[PDB]
């Protein structure tokens, strides 16, 4: 079906303890493939998937230079936003950014996204027209007028419509064995004791999109097994049947607890 | 927009100069560039809200700073002949990779070994040809500046006390009088073509002005002839017939 | 590592001609590419800014392309005008480094539909004047180091909508006349030589 490439950034200021901690990661669909952490001795963008290691040094140097420039831009933004919100320089604050592009099975661009948060709340975001901003408060409106003046969206829109799609198309080709294959779950049900519980399990599946009494049912968040696979279970307190729907499954499987 | 000071600068080797720049109002970033013939336009240093941000291949003897009022200074010390170049200031709103810079007029620096060869120009106006008025029905007047060094000259025309620009041409570069001698004096020509009836009107004043940028009155001078300071030599011409 | 090169270094064309100015660079990890025009007095003025991910930009008669993969940029100038005469420099922004190219010096010659070449002698305050010739007429330099020949230079009388090239010659020689002042340069045979 459809695919995606995303880049996540996080800068957390550390007052009196030095320069802010910067961590950025890159995802194709739900697969991590690149990272950069400022808390390393020699900070460089490092690979996290086999299909990305084939890139030459001109790729990794550019990725490292862009990560370091974003860490520098964030350090200035932290101090700038203290002025905007009139906050003390003694407190830790967090700037998050996410940007990326959604492509369909045909390879064209479905949606481009670029959004920033400050202390966990939305700050400014590129609208889906890739041409206008929505700022969350009057301080973000300061950023918005500066970003409109400097024609920031023009570059974002060119990247999301152009470079983002082209490289996502390349990544899926070089990693078609791991990025375009869907691993179905390994479902089983257990019983935990005039009252008891039935637990519908789903283990080792990719991608993360999985569907398992919409009131009394207890459903945990999808968790990674640590080996690129995922897990999920649901519980309720023969007359019960848990529905299992996944893209890697031939049919939506229904299962009852075999005693 | 961006303004620089001084516009021109004549100095000797080993000296030290300060180049000043006031960026566009509201701009936080200032940039310095050196344009030379053998290297073209070369990026020296960039300041952003008082903090040095970026540097090109700036010399150890070059020193720069951005002040709290956002205006910038460039100090060039222990000067050499190779430091002769155009120095440009630019400014930008901030550091946006999506936005452009805005350049100033530039400062022209020529460094000489000694100021003994510095000479002010001699100016002369040449009235139009009688045979041209009868043929082209127009009258052109040529201004000539001779024997100046270096080439820091700005020629302008002044018709009837006020300055003009239409019907004016001026050589883009000065002309070397004696390409044999390496330290040859320069020459420059400019023409002013007016209507034949306007020059024939005997109550019209024509005056070409040559702003020669030479030494300052603060420099030394140990020669008996006049000190070649920044002056304005000009030649006058009135209507004839 | 960044090396920005431009071709051609100079360009002298008739007005109205579509121009192709080329720019090349060796490091593709740029933030933007710019085209500036430099006039001798006013300094540099940005004409087009192409964002990192953009492939083209446009502004009136100007249209520039960008190909980071091959490291090339082409500026297109449709219907060149004499007011476009300047030096055109491409600039790239890299990581903490800005680079400029050698530049293309562009001279757009106007169209003299009524050429009337002639050589006159102006009243010595000795100056000879070759004027009103077509833009194809090239003013060659002197054959003697005592005669000074300036290159052609267009003056615009916008009040009457008329342009005319001219070249000035002067010398201190006693045996110096305007009939032979520009004889080292190829001159139209219909050039009026008054007596």
């Amino acid at each position: 079906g459809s695919h995606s490439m995303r880049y996540f950034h996080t800068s957390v200021s550390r007052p009196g303890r030095g320069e802010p901690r910067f961590i950025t990661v890159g995802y194709v669909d739900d697969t991590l493939f690149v990272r950069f952490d400022s808390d390393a001795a020699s900070p460089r963008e490092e690979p996290r998937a086999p299909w990305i290691e084939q890139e030459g040094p001109e790729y990794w140097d550019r990725e490292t230079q862009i990560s370091k420039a974003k860490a520098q831009t964030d350090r200035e933004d932290l101090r700038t936003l203290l002025r905007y919100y009139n906050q003390s320089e003694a407190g830790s604050h967090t700037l998050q950014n996410m940007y990326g592009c959604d492509v369909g099975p045909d390879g064209r661009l479905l949606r481009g996204y670029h959004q920033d948060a400050y202390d966990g709340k939305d700050y400014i975001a590129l609208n889906e027209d890739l041409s206008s901003w929505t700022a969350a408060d009057t301080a973000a409106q300061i950023t918005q007028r500066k970003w409109e003046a400097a024609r920031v969206a023009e570059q974002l829109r060119a990247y999301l419509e152009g470079e983002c799609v082209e490289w996502l198309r390349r990544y899926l080709e070089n990693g078609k064995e791991t990025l375009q294959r869907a691993d179905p779950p390994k479902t089983h049900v257990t019983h935990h004791p005039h009252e008891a519980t039935l637990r519908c399990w789903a283990l080792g599946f990719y991608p993360a999109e999985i569907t398992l009494q919409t009131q009394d049912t207890e459903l945990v968040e999808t968790r990674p097994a640590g080996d690129r696979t995922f897990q999920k279970w649901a519980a309720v307190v023969q007359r019960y049947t848990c529905h299992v729907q996944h893209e890697g499954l031939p049919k939506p499987l229904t299962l009852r607890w075999e005693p | 927009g961006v303004t620089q000071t001084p516009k021109h600068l004549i100095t000797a080797t080993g000296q030290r100069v300060t180049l000043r720049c006031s960026p566009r109002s509201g701009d936080l970033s200032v940039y310095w560039y050196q344009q030379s013939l053998d290297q073209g336009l070369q990026f020296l240093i960039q300041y952003y809200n008082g903090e040095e941000r970026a540097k090109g291949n700036i010399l150890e003897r070059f020193s720069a700073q951005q002040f709290p009022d956002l205006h910038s200074e460039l100090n060039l010390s222990s000067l050499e002949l190779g430091d002769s170049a155009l120095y440009f200031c630019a400014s930008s709103v901030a550091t946006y990779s999506t936005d452009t810079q805005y350049f100033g007029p530039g400062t022209r620096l020529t460094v000489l070994e000694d100021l003994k060869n510095v000479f002010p120009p001699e100016v002369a106006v040449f009235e139009p040809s009688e045979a041209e008025i009868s043929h082209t029905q127009k009258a052109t007047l040529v201004c000539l500046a001779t024997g100046f060094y270096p080439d820091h000259v700005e020629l302008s025309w002044w018709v009837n006390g006020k300055e003009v620009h239409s019907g004016v041409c001026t050589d883009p570069q000065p002309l070397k009088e004696q390409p044999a001698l390496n330290d040859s004096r320069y020459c420059l020509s400019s023409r002013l073509r007016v209507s034949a009836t306007f020059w024939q009107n005997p109550r019209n004043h024509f005056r070409c002005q040559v702003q020669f940028y030479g030494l300052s009155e603060n420099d030394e001078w140990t020669q008996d002839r006049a000190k070649p300071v920044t002056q304005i030599v000009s030649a006058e011409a009135w209507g004839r017939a | 590592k960044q090396e920005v090169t431009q071709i051609p270094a100079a360009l002298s064309v008739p007005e109205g001609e579509n121009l192709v100015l080329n720019c090349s660079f060796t490091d593709s990890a740029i933030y933007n590419l710019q085209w500036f025009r430099q006039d001798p007095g006013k300094g540099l003025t940005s004409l087009l800014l192409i964002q990192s991910s953009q492939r083209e930009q446009t502004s009136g008669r100007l249209n520039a392309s960008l190909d980071k993969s091959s490291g090339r940029s082409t500026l297109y100038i449709a219907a060149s005008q004499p007011g476009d005469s300047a030096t055109y420099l491409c600039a790239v922004s890299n990581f903490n480094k800005f680079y400029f190219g050698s530049g293309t010096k562009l001279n757009v010659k106007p169209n003299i539909q009524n050429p009337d070449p002639a050589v006159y002698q102006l009243r010595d305050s000795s100056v000879c004047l070759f004027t009103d010739f077509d833009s194809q007429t090239n003013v060659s330099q002197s054959k003697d180091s005592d005669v000074y020949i300036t290159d052609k230079c267009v003056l615009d009388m916008r009040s009457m909508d008329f342009k005319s090239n001219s070249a000035v010659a002067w010398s201190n020689k006693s045996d110096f006349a305007c009939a032979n002042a520009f004889n080292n340069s190829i001159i139209p045979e219909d050039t009026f030589f008054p007596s």
């Binding site: 550019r62 990725e63 420039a69 933004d77 920031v152 470079e163 | 550091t95 946006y96 990779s97 | 933030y31």
Partner: peptide, 9 residues
């Protein structure tokens, strides 16, 4: 590949 953009807030 990552986006090349410098845009202070």
């Amino acid at each position: 590949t990552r986006l090349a953009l410098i845009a202070p807030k």
